Every structure is written in C-alpha cells, then in structure tokens.
Amino acid sequence: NVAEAGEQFGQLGRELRAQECLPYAAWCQLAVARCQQALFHGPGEALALTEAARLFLRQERDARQRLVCPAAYGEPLQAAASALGAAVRLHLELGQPAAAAALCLELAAALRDLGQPAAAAGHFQRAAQLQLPQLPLAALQALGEAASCQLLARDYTGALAVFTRMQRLAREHGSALGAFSDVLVRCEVSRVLLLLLLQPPPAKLLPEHAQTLEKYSLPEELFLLLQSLVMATHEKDTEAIKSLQVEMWPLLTAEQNHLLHLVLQETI
Amino acid sequence: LVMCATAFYLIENYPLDVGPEFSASIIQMCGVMLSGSEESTPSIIYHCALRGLERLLLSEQLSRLDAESLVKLSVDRVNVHSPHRAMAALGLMLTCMYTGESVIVAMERVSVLFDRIRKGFPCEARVVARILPQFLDDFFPPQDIMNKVIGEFLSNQQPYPQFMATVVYKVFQTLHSTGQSSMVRDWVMLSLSNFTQRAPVAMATWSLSCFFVSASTSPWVAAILPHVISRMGKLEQVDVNLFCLVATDFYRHQ
C-alpha cells in the first residue's frame, strides 16, 4: 500500500518532461519523498529530493537565460534551494558527509549563472568543511570557484580571506605534488595583485601577508614581472605600470586579468 | 530575508495592536545574526536587516529603554575586520547619537572612529576622514576636540598620516569664525614642543608644513595643502625651501 503508493508517482513524472511543463513534474518528484519518511528508506529517501532539484533549476534557464523575463522573480529559485535543504540533512544522520557536499556544489553553480554572485560566494564554503576531513583536493577546488564569485560580487577584502586558506592546506598536504602544485600557482599571483589594489595597514597585515611581500621587494617568465610591479606602486611610477599590462596580458588567465585592471586605476 | 522585513513594519506603524513585549524582542534577534562571522550569516542577509534598525529609531515610537538596546550592538561590530561588513555598522553609531554622564559617555564613542584609520583598509578609511571634520564641530566644544586629534596624529602607530592630513585641515577653517579665530593661535604653540622629540629626519619635517597651512591667512596659503600632502616622504632640495615660507607668515599672523 504505502510501498505501492510510491510506484504510482514515478510513472507520472516521466510523461511530463516530454510534455515539458516542469514545475509540475517538479511537484511530482516531491511526492515520492514524503512517503519514504513514513517508511524508512534512508539513502533512497534522498534520491527523490534531488531529482526535484534538477527540475526547478531548469524552469529558470527558461526564465533568466533562454527566455530572459523581467517578470521572472525566483519562485522556482526559492523552490530550488528548499528541496535541497532536506537533502543535506539526511546524509549526515546516516553519516556520509562526503555525499552531503556533492549536493551543495550544484546549488551554487546556478546562483553564479542566475546573476547572484554574493550569495554564490556563500554555498561554496559550506561544501568544503564537509570535505576537509575527507578529500583535501576535492575541498580546494570548491574554494577556487569561491574566489571567482566575490570578484563579481566586488568583495575585494573578503577575497583576501579565501586566498590564504587555499595556501595553508597545501603546505600541510602537498609538500608540492601535482594536483596541489597548480593550486599554489594561482594563489601567489593573485595575493600580490590584491595587496596593491587594497594596501592593508600593519595592524591588519597578518604574519602570512608579511612573508610574501619581502620576497618581491611559479614560472620564470611570470615570476620576474611580479617583483617589478610591487616596486612601481611604492614609487608611484606612471610609466612603469602602463607597459606591464601590455606585457602581462597573455601570461595570466582572465580571472587573474581582472585583478590587474583595478590596481592601475587606483594608482592612476 | 523576507521574513525580517515585515517584522520592522509592525513596530513603527502598528505598535499597540501587538504586545509591548513583542517590540523589544525583534531587536535582540538581530544581535546574534549581525555579530555572526563572515560566513555564518551571508553578506546579503547582513546588509538588509541592519538598514531597518536605523529606521525605527528615527521613528519616534520606541521607548527609552527599548532604544538603548540598539546602542550596545553597534559598538561591537565596528571592530570586525571586513570593511564592507564594517561600513554599514558605522551608520548605526550615528543615529542613536542623533536621536539623543552626558559629557562622560560620549568620550567612548568618538575614539572608535579613530581606530578604523589605524586598523582598516584604505578602501574603508576614505569614508572616515570626510566625516570627522564635520562630526566633531557639532557635538562637543573644540577645547575637547583638540586633544584627541593631534596626539593621535603624531603617534608612531599611525599607518599613514596621509588621510589623517585631511582631517585637521577642515577643523581650523570652521574655527576661523570671529569668536574663535584667536583660539586657533594658542593650539599652534603646544604642538611645536612635541616635534623637538623627533620622528625620522625626513619624516619629521613633513608634518610641520601641513599644520601652519591650516592655520594661516585666507587667500593663498590654504590652497597649498594638497600640493604638500602629495609628497609625503622623499625629501628634496626643493622640499627644504617650502618649509621656510609657510611658518613665517604665521609669525606676522600673531
């Protein structure tokens, strides 16, 4: 009966996706999960709640990406993060905190697409603390997509907090290997373009920020042009800074090309 | 976010239809949330519950005991590290003083502004140097405002006097009102004794030239100060000649 009640709601949800409604096939998936709380199915109870998460985030690529509607206002964006609230709480009671952080990296790759880059910063740091005991290189790629949010969200001071946490694990885990050898190239080229953008006072300059700026005042091509740029902004040299962006534009990627643009304006 | 927005609409407009015990307990739930960490309560949840707190104070509805609960929570959040988080907390310290022992308790609030210059990023401390000229002239008389500025201008734990140089300039030219323009002259004498105990020799002579400009004649000495604070260090033969011209027009100003 209550076992046979769950098989009836599964035939209904598949004849609607070809019919292509999808708030109602999205409402068909939340009915499968309410039965399995009356019985106790465990890891299959969390399978009905995360196929209802795939179907409210497809109602809003047809409302903010494919059909960019000014009347679209997040009723299936409020619906998307509420079926994922009951999903993460049910892996932890069964005790698998590595599966709880797979479902929170899906919620934060939509909010960077739907144009909410400050609350996208957000949910990337929730899925790392559920992985730092378990997978310290699956945990350091969720913090490299957290630095691409706050520079869209223009949080340049909160962006110094998340770059010194990537580098403090690779000296505990990597010393570098490999997969951890490319996480440390991205974090000593981008903590140097922020301390000239915002130049911190010696009270709020940590003992980790103190070490990297004595070395300058990683590839041999790009290590030589970064010692030269910390000198000019301490000399206020307007001719020195202009010829380096011409000669550091192919070297960086366009996430590191955004931090060099905002220094040359705030010194000129 | 939407559920804390309708709590603020009840206390202002419709007080008596809900209990008096219900008004003071929405104030307390924004203490735990606003004194959370930079990842416990997000930046979008942070900035929206805090703008509604200075609304209720400007409304004349809250009680005298209900208003001073908001005063304590705003002190503890100016000394958090994130300045976008800490720029909004500086707005709450004003309004409580702008809805309101009288001499004694106002001593503690003014020195909170001076530390954000010391600790705090230069994207933050541009805001703090535009206010504090205008801020001190309104509350408490300029005999008390003068002691805190220069002794926290000359200090070795000043990370830059550059933005602290613009603070001292706008004070004196409002003190060039006709009643207090001669009291401008007495404070120039005491600060000269402090320079004889020395800063470094390039650094010590730069701070002398910025002070006599702000206490000078009207038409042309006053416009030199952004040319002076442009070059903060880097002593020059052209730098030695500029110090002589400024402090002698003050000798014929006495």
Side-chain angles (χ1 to χ4, degrees), chain A residues 233-261:
Chain A
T233 62
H234 295 172
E235 293 173 352
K236 298 181 291 295
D237 197 358
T238 62
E239 289 180 352
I241 310 169
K242 289 184 180 181
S243 295
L244 300 180
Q245 190 171 11
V246 172
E247 289 180 349
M248 290 181 68
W249 189 260
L251 271 302
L252 301 176
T253 188
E255 297 177 354
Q256 275 79 244
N257 286 122
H258 175 64
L259 288 174
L260 194 273
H261 174 71

PDB file of all heavy atoms in Angstrom, chain A residues 233-261:
ATOM      1  N   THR A 233      54.268  50.855  -7.694  1.00  0.00           N
ATOM      2  CA  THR A 233      53.221  51.443  -6.877  1.00  0.00           C
ATOM      3  C   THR A 233      53.733  51.931  -5.529  1.00  0.00           C
ATOM      4  O   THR A 233      53.011  52.648  -4.829  1.00  0.00           O
ATOM      5  CB  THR A 233      52.107  50.423  -6.686  1.00  0.00           C
ATOM      6  OG1 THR A 233      52.628  49.283  -5.998  1.00  0.00           O
ATOM      7  CG2 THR A 233      51.600  49.977  -8.036  1.00  0.00           C
ATOM      8  N   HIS A 234      54.952  51.549  -5.149  1.00  0.00           N
ATOM      9  CA  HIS A 234      55.603  52.136  -3.987  1.00  0.00           C
ATOM     10  C   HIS A 234      56.471  53.311  -4.405  1.00  0.00           C
ATOM     11  O   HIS A 234      56.910  54.102  -3.563  1.00  0.00           O
ATOM     12  CB  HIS A 234      56.433  51.076  -3.267  1.00  0.00           C
ATOM     13  CG  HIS A 234      55.617  49.968  -2.679  1.00  0.00           C
ATOM     14  ND1 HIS A 234      56.181  48.833  -2.139  1.00  0.00           N
ATOM     15  CD2 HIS A 234      54.277  49.817  -2.552  1.00  0.00           C
ATOM     16  CE1 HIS A 234      55.227  48.032  -1.702  1.00  0.00           C
ATOM     17  NE2 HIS A 234      54.061  48.606  -1.939  1.00  0.00           N
ATOM     18  N   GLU A 235      56.746  53.424  -5.705  1.00  0.00           N
ATOM     19  CA  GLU A 235      57.419  54.583  -6.270  1.00  0.00           C
ATOM     20  C   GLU A 235      56.464  55.512  -7.005  1.00  0.00           C
ATOM     21  O   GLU A 235      56.893  56.599  -7.406  1.00  0.00           O
ATOM     22  CB  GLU A 235      58.528  54.127  -7.220  1.00  0.00           C
ATOM     23  CG  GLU A 235      59.675  53.420  -6.532  1.00  0.00           C
ATOM     24  CD  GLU A 235      60.670  52.842  -7.514  1.00  0.00           C
ATOM     25  OE1 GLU A 235      60.391  52.872  -8.726  1.00  0.00           O
ATOM     26  OE2 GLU A 235      61.728  52.350  -7.076  1.00  0.00           O
ATOM     27  N   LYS A 236      55.198  55.099  -7.173  1.00  0.00           N
ATOM     28  CA  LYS A 236      54.150  55.852  -7.881  1.00  0.00           C
ATOM     29  C   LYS A 236      54.585  56.206  -9.299  1.00  0.00           C
ATOM     30  O   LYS A 236      54.535  57.362  -9.720  1.00  0.00           O
ATOM     31  CB  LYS A 236      53.735  57.098  -7.098  1.00  0.00           C
ATOM     32  CG  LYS A 236      53.143  56.790  -5.738  1.00  0.00           C
ATOM     33  CD  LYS A 236      52.719  58.058  -5.019  1.00  0.00           C
ATOM     34  CE  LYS A 236      53.927  58.883  -4.600  1.00  0.00           C
ATOM     35  NZ  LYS A 236      54.761  58.184  -3.585  1.00  0.00           N
ATOM     36  N   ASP A 237      55.013  55.191 -10.044  1.00  0.00           N
ATOM     37  CA  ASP A 237      55.641  55.374 -11.347  1.00  0.00           C
ATOM     38  C   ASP A 237      54.596  55.111 -12.428  1.00  0.00           C
ATOM     39  O   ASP A 237      54.251  53.958 -12.696  1.00  0.00           O
ATOM     40  CB  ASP A 237      56.843  54.442 -11.484  1.00  0.00           C
ATOM     41  CG  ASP A 237      57.772  54.839 -12.610  1.00  0.00           C
ATOM     42  OD1 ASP A 237      57.476  55.816 -13.324  1.00  0.00           O
ATOM     43  OD2 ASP A 237      58.818  54.178 -12.772  1.00  0.00           O
ATOM     44  N   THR A 238      54.106  56.183 -13.053  1.00  0.00           N
ATOM     45  CA  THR A 238      53.004  56.050 -14.001  1.00  0.00           C
ATOM     46  C   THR A 238      53.463  55.463 -15.327  1.00  0.00           C
ATOM     47  O   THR A 238      52.652  54.917 -16.076  1.00  0.00           O
ATOM     48  CB  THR A 238      52.349  57.403 -14.248  1.00  0.00           C
ATOM     49  OG1 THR A 238      53.311  58.294 -14.822  1.00  0.00           O
ATOM     50  CG2 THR A 238      51.842  57.981 -12.953  1.00  0.00           C
ATOM     51  N   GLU A 239      54.748  55.582 -15.653  1.00  0.00           N
ATOM     52  CA  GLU A 239      55.220  54.996 -16.901  1.00  0.00           C
ATOM     53  C   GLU A 239      55.593  53.536 -16.715  1.00  0.00           C
ATOM     54  O   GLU A 239      55.568  52.754 -17.668  1.00  0.00           O
ATOM     55  CB  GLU A 239      56.399  55.795 -17.449  1.00  0.00           C
ATOM     56  CG  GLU A 239      56.000  57.157 -17.985  1.00  0.00           C
ATOM     57  CD  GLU A 239      57.177  57.939 -18.521  1.00  0.00           C
ATOM     58  OE1 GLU A 239      58.328  57.490 -18.331  1.00  0.00           O
ATOM     59  OE2 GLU A 239      56.953  58.998 -19.142  1.00  0.00           O
ATOM     60  N   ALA A 240      55.879  53.129 -15.479  1.00  0.00           N
ATOM     61  CA  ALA A 240      56.257  51.743 -15.239  1.00  0.00           C
ATOM     62  C   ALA A 240      55.050  50.815 -15.281  1.00  0.00           C
ATOM     63  O   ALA A 240      55.148  49.683 -15.760  1.00  0.00           O
ATOM     64  CB  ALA A 240      56.976  51.615 -13.899  1.00  0.00           C
ATOM     65  N   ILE A 241      53.891  51.279 -14.816  1.00  0.00           N
ATOM     66  CA  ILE A 241      52.760  50.367 -14.677  1.00  0.00           C
ATOM     67  C   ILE A 241      52.060  50.166 -16.016  1.00  0.00           C
ATOM     68  O   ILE A 241      51.382  49.159 -16.228  1.00  0.00           O
ATOM     69  CB  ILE A 241      51.791  50.881 -13.602  1.00  0.00           C
ATOM     70  CG1 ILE A 241      52.546  51.214 -12.333  1.00  0.00           C
ATOM     71  CG2 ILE A 241      50.831  49.800 -13.164  1.00  0.00           C
ATOM     72  CD1 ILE A 241      51.711  51.976 -11.329  1.00  0.00           C
ATOM     73  N   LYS A 242      52.234  51.087 -16.960  1.00  0.00           N
ATOM     74  CA  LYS A 242      51.455  51.003 -18.191  1.00  0.00           C
ATOM     75  C   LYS A 242      52.049  49.993 -19.164  1.00  0.00           C
ATOM     76  O   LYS A 242      51.321  49.355 -19.927  1.00  0.00           O
ATOM     77  CB  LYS A 242      51.337  52.380 -18.838  1.00  0.00           C
ATOM     78  CG  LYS A 242      50.441  53.324 -18.065  1.00  0.00           C
ATOM     79  CD  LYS A 242      50.265  54.640 -18.792  1.00  0.00           C
ATOM     80  CE  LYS A 242      49.370  55.575 -18.007  1.00  0.00           C
ATOM     81  NZ  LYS A 242      49.171  56.864 -18.719  1.00  0.00           N
ATOM     82  N   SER A 243      53.368  49.814 -19.140  1.00  0.00           N
ATOM     83  CA  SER A 243      53.987  48.892 -20.084  1.00  0.00           C
ATOM     84  C   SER A 243      53.992  47.453 -19.589  1.00  0.00           C
ATOM     85  O   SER A 243      54.466  46.570 -20.309  1.00  0.00           O
ATOM     86  CB  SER A 243      55.413  49.333 -20.399  1.00  0.00           C
ATOM     87  OG  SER A 243      55.414  50.574 -21.078  1.00  0.00           O
ATOM     88  N   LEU A 244      53.500  47.196 -18.380  1.00  0.00           N
ATOM     89  CA  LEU A 244      53.465  45.831 -17.881  1.00  0.00           C
ATOM     90  C   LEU A 244      52.149  45.123 -18.163  1.00  0.00           C
ATOM     91  O   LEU A 244      52.150  43.902 -18.321  1.00  0.00           O
ATOM     92  CB  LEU A 244      53.748  45.805 -16.380  1.00  0.00           C
ATOM     93  CG  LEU A 244      55.115  46.376 -16.012  1.00  0.00           C
ATOM     94  CD1 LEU A 244      55.335  46.326 -14.520  1.00  0.00           C
ATOM     95  CD2 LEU A 244      56.217  45.652 -16.735  1.00  0.00           C
ATOM     96  N   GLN A 245      51.036  45.847 -18.235  1.00  0.00           N
ATOM     97  CA  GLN A 245      49.768  45.226 -18.593  1.00  0.00           C
ATOM     98  C   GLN A 245      49.754  44.825 -20.059  1.00  0.00           C
ATOM     99  O   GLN A 245      49.143  43.815 -20.423  1.00  0.00           O
ATOM    100  CB  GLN A 245      48.603  46.163 -18.289  1.00  0.00           C
ATOM    101  CG  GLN A 245      47.254  45.494 -18.410  1.00  0.00           C
ATOM    102  CD  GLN A 245      46.138  46.360 -17.904  1.00  0.00           C
ATOM    103  OE1 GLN A 245      46.326  47.546 -17.649  1.00  0.00           O
ATOM    104  NE2 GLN A 245      44.977  45.759 -17.695  1.00  0.00           N
ATOM    105  N   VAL A 246      50.447  45.598 -20.895  1.00  0.00           N
ATOM    106  CA  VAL A 246      50.713  45.201 -22.270  1.00  0.00           C
ATOM    107  C   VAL A 246      51.547  43.920 -22.308  1.00  0.00           C
ATOM    108  O   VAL A 246      51.337  43.052 -23.164  1.00  0.00           O
ATOM    109  CB  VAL A 246      51.388  46.376 -23.000  1.00  0.00           C
ATOM    110  CG1 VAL A 246      51.879  45.988 -24.368  1.00  0.00           C
ATOM    111  CG2 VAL A 246      50.410  47.532 -23.115  1.00  0.00           C
ATOM    112  N   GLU A 247      52.454  43.747 -21.351  1.00  0.00           N
ATOM    113  CA  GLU A 247      53.319  42.574 -21.327  1.00  0.00           C
ATOM    114  C   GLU A 247      52.985  41.573 -20.228  1.00  0.00           C
ATOM    115  O   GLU A 247      53.820  40.720 -19.928  1.00  0.00           O
ATOM    116  CB  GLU A 247      54.781  42.998 -21.195  1.00  0.00           C
ATOM    117  CG  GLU A 247      55.334  43.646 -22.448  1.00  0.00           C
ATOM    118  CD  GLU A 247      56.781  44.065 -22.305  1.00  0.00           C
ATOM    119  OE1 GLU A 247      57.298  44.045 -21.172  1.00  0.00           O
ATOM    120  OE2 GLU A 247      57.408  44.394 -23.333  1.00  0.00           O
ATOM    121  N   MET A 248      51.806  41.652 -19.613  1.00  0.00           N
ATOM    122  CA  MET A 248      51.328  40.575 -18.753  1.00  0.00           C
ATOM    123  C   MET A 248      49.932  40.117 -19.141  1.00  0.00           C
ATOM    124  O   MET A 248      49.285  39.394 -18.379  1.00  0.00           O
ATOM    125  CB  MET A 248      51.342  40.974 -17.279  1.00  0.00           C
ATOM    126  CG  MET A 248      52.719  41.106 -16.693  1.00  0.00           C
ATOM    127  SD  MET A 248      52.625  41.562 -14.959  1.00  0.00           S
ATOM    128  CE  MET A 248      51.922  40.061 -14.291  1.00  0.00           C
ATOM    129  N   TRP A 249      49.454  40.525 -20.296  1.00  0.00           N
ATOM    130  CA  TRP A 249      48.119  40.125 -20.716  1.00  0.00           C
ATOM    131  C   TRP A 249      48.057  38.689 -21.248  1.00  0.00           C
ATOM    132  O   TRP A 249      47.099  37.988 -20.902  1.00  0.00           O
ATOM    133  CB  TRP A 249      47.567  41.113 -21.742  1.00  0.00           C
ATOM    134  CG  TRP A 249      46.140  40.901 -22.080  1.00  0.00           C
ATOM    135  CD1 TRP A 249      45.643  40.263 -23.170  1.00  0.00           C
ATOM    136  CD2 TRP A 249      45.016  41.355 -21.332  1.00  0.00           C
ATOM    137  NE1 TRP A 249      44.271  40.277 -23.145  1.00  0.00           N
ATOM    138  CE2 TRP A 249      43.863  40.944 -22.023  1.00  0.00           C
ATOM    139  CE3 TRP A 249      44.871  42.060 -20.139  1.00  0.00           C
ATOM    140  CZ2 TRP A 249      42.586  41.219 -21.563  1.00  0.00           C
ATOM    141  CZ3 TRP A 249      43.606  42.326 -19.682  1.00  0.00           C
ATOM    142  CH2 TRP A 249      42.477  41.912 -20.393  1.00  0.00           C
ATOM    143  N   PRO A 250      48.997  38.179 -22.064  1.00  0.00           N
ATOM    144  CA  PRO A 250      48.929  36.745 -22.382  1.00  0.00           C
ATOM    145  C   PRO A 250      49.314  35.832 -21.237  1.00  0.00           C
ATOM    146  O   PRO A 250      48.990  34.642 -21.297  1.00  0.00           O
ATOM    147  CB  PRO A 250      49.915  36.590 -23.544  1.00  0.00           C
ATOM    148  CG  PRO A 250      50.032  37.919 -24.125  1.00  0.00           C
ATOM    149  CD  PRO A 250      49.973  38.831 -22.965  1.00  0.00           C
ATOM    150  N   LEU A 251      49.986  36.333 -20.204  1.00  0.00           N
ATOM    151  CA  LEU A 251      50.557  35.438 -19.203  1.00  0.00           C
ATOM    152  C   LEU A 251      49.498  34.938 -18.229  1.00  0.00           C
ATOM    153  O   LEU A 251      49.452  33.748 -17.900  1.00  0.00           O
ATOM    154  CB  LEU A 251      51.690  36.137 -18.453  1.00  0.00           C
ATOM    155  CG  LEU A 251      53.104  36.037 -19.029  1.00  0.00           C
ATOM    156  CD1 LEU A 251      53.480  34.576 -19.145  1.00  0.00           C
ATOM    157  CD2 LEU A 251      53.283  36.749 -20.360  1.00  0.00           C
ATOM    158  N   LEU A 252      48.639  35.832 -17.759  1.00  0.00           N
ATOM    159  CA  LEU A 252      47.600  35.485 -16.808  1.00  0.00           C
ATOM    160  C   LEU A 252      46.400  34.872 -17.521  1.00  0.00           C
ATOM    161  O   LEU A 252      46.273  34.931 -18.745  1.00  0.00           O
ATOM    162  CB  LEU A 252      47.161  36.728 -16.050  1.00  0.00           C
ATOM    163  CG  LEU A 252      48.297  37.391 -15.293  1.00  0.00           C
ATOM    164  CD1 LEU A 252      47.838  38.675 -14.648  1.00  0.00           C
ATOM    165  CD2 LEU A 252      48.777  36.421 -14.274  1.00  0.00           C
ATOM    166  N   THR A 253      45.501  34.283 -16.738  1.00  0.00           N
ATOM    167  CA  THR A 253      44.177  33.968 -17.248  1.00  0.00           C
ATOM    168  C   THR A 253      43.225  35.105 -16.898  1.00  0.00           C
ATOM    169  O   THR A 253      43.548  36.001 -16.119  1.00  0.00           O
ATOM    170  CB  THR A 253      43.678  32.642 -16.689  1.00  0.00           C
ATOM    171  OG1 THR A 253      42.464  32.274 -17.354  1.00  0.00           O
ATOM    172  CG2 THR A 253      43.393  32.771 -15.224  1.00  0.00           C
ATOM    173  N   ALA A 254      42.021  35.072 -17.463  1.00  0.00           N
ATOM    174  CA  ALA A 254      41.139  36.224 -17.349  1.00  0.00           C
ATOM    175  C   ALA A 254      40.420  36.310 -16.012  1.00  0.00           C
ATOM    176  O   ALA A 254      39.610  37.218 -15.823  1.00  0.00           O
ATOM    177  CB  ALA A 254      40.116  36.214 -18.479  1.00  0.00           C
ATOM    178  N   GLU A 255      40.689  35.402 -15.078  1.00  0.00           N
ATOM    179  CA  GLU A 255      40.334  35.679 -13.693  1.00  0.00           C
ATOM    180  C   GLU A 255      41.442  36.477 -13.022  1.00  0.00           C
ATOM    181  O   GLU A 255      41.178  37.460 -12.325  1.00  0.00           O
ATOM    182  CB  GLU A 255      40.062  34.373 -12.953  1.00  0.00           C
ATOM    183  CG  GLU A 255      38.878  33.589 -13.513  1.00  0.00           C
ATOM    184  CD  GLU A 255      38.655  32.263 -12.806  1.00  0.00           C
ATOM    185  OE1 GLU A 255      39.488  31.891 -11.956  1.00  0.00           O
ATOM    186  OE2 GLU A 255      37.646  31.589 -13.105  1.00  0.00           O
ATOM    187  N   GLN A 256      42.700  36.108 -13.268  1.00  0.00           N
ATOM    188  CA  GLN A 256      43.805  36.956 -12.843  1.00  0.00           C
ATOM    189  C   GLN A 256      43.979  38.193 -13.715  1.00  0.00           C
ATOM    190  O   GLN A 256      44.720  39.092 -13.327  1.00  0.00           O
ATOM    191  CB  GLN A 256      45.126  36.186 -12.818  1.00  0.00           C
ATOM    192  CG  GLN A 256      45.393  35.407 -11.546  1.00  0.00           C
ATOM    193  CD  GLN A 256      44.656  34.094 -11.477  1.00  0.00           C
ATOM    194  OE1 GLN A 256      43.794  33.891 -10.620  1.00  0.00           O
ATOM    195  NE2 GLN A 256      45.018  33.172 -12.357  1.00  0.00           N
ATOM    196  N   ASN A 257      43.323  38.285 -14.874  1.00  0.00           N
ATOM    197  CA  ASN A 257      43.423  39.533 -15.624  1.00  0.00           C
ATOM    198  C   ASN A 257      42.479  40.588 -15.086  1.00  0.00           C
ATOM    199  O   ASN A 257      42.600  41.753 -15.452  1.00  0.00           O
ATOM    200  CB  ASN A 257      43.146  39.348 -17.114  1.00  0.00           C
ATOM    201  CG  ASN A 257      44.277  38.668 -17.842  1.00  0.00           C
ATOM    202  OD1 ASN A 257      44.094  37.624 -18.461  1.00  0.00           O
ATOM    203  ND2 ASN A 257      45.462  39.256 -17.760  1.00  0.00           N
ATOM    204  N   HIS A 258      41.559  40.222 -14.198  1.00  0.00           N
ATOM    205  CA  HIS A 258      40.654  41.221 -13.641  1.00  0.00           C
ATOM    206  C   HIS A 258      41.279  41.933 -12.451  1.00  0.00           C
ATOM    207  O   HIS A 258      40.945  43.079 -12.165  1.00  0.00           O
ATOM    208  CB  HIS A 258      39.325  40.580 -13.239  1.00  0.00           C
ATOM    209  CG  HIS A 258      38.394  41.523 -12.549  1.00  0.00           C
ATOM    210  ND1 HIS A 258      37.872  42.636 -13.169  1.00  0.00           N
ATOM    211  CD2 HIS A 258      37.890  41.521 -11.295  1.00  0.00           C
ATOM    212  CE1 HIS A 258      37.095  43.286 -12.322  1.00  0.00           C
ATOM    213  NE2 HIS A 258      37.085  42.629 -11.178  1.00  0.00           N
ATOM    214  N   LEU A 259      42.195  41.280 -11.748  1.00  0.00           N
ATOM    215  CA  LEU A 259      42.750  41.925 -10.564  1.00  0.00           C
ATOM    216  C   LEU A 259      43.857  42.904 -10.927  1.00  0.00           C
ATOM    217  O   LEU A 259      44.147  43.823 -10.162  1.00  0.00           O
ATOM    218  CB  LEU A 259      43.227  40.881  -9.567  1.00  0.00           C
ATOM    219  CG  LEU A 259      41.984  40.241  -8.958  1.00  0.00           C
ATOM    220  CD1 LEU A 259      42.346  39.106  -8.063  1.00  0.00           C
ATOM    221  CD2 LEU A 259      41.176  41.268  -8.196  1.00  0.00           C
ATOM    222  N   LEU A 260      44.438  42.779 -12.115  1.00  0.00           N
ATOM    223  CA  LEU A 260      45.484  43.717 -12.510  1.00  0.00           C
ATOM    224  C   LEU A 260      44.883  44.978 -13.114  1.00  0.00           C
ATOM    225  O   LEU A 260      45.543  46.012 -13.172  1.00  0.00           O
ATOM    226  CB  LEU A 260      46.460  43.037 -13.472  1.00  0.00           C
ATOM    227  CG  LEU A 260      47.831  43.628 -13.823  1.00  0.00           C
ATOM    228  CD1 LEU A 260      47.820  44.596 -14.959  1.00  0.00           C
ATOM    229  CD2 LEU A 260      48.400  44.311 -12.620  1.00  0.00           C
ATOM    230  N   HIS A 261      43.620  44.935 -13.524  1.00  0.00           N
ATOM    231  CA  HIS A 261      42.992  46.120 -14.096  1.00  0.00           C
ATOM    232  C   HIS A 261      42.615  47.125 -13.023  1.00  0.00           C
ATOM    233  O   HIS A 261      42.608  48.328 -13.266  1.00  0.00           O
ATOM    234  CB  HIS A 261      41.761  45.722 -14.898  1.00  0.00           C
ATOM    235  CG  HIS A 261      40.971  46.888 -15.397  1.00  0.00           C
ATOM    236  ND1 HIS A 261      41.422  47.712 -16.404  1.00  0.00           N
ATOM    237  CD2 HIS A 261      39.771  47.381 -15.014  1.00  0.00           C
ATOM    238  CE1 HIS A 261      40.527  48.655 -16.627  1.00  0.00           C
ATOM    239  NE2 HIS A 261      39.516  48.479 -15.796  1.00  0.00           N
TER     240      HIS A 261
END
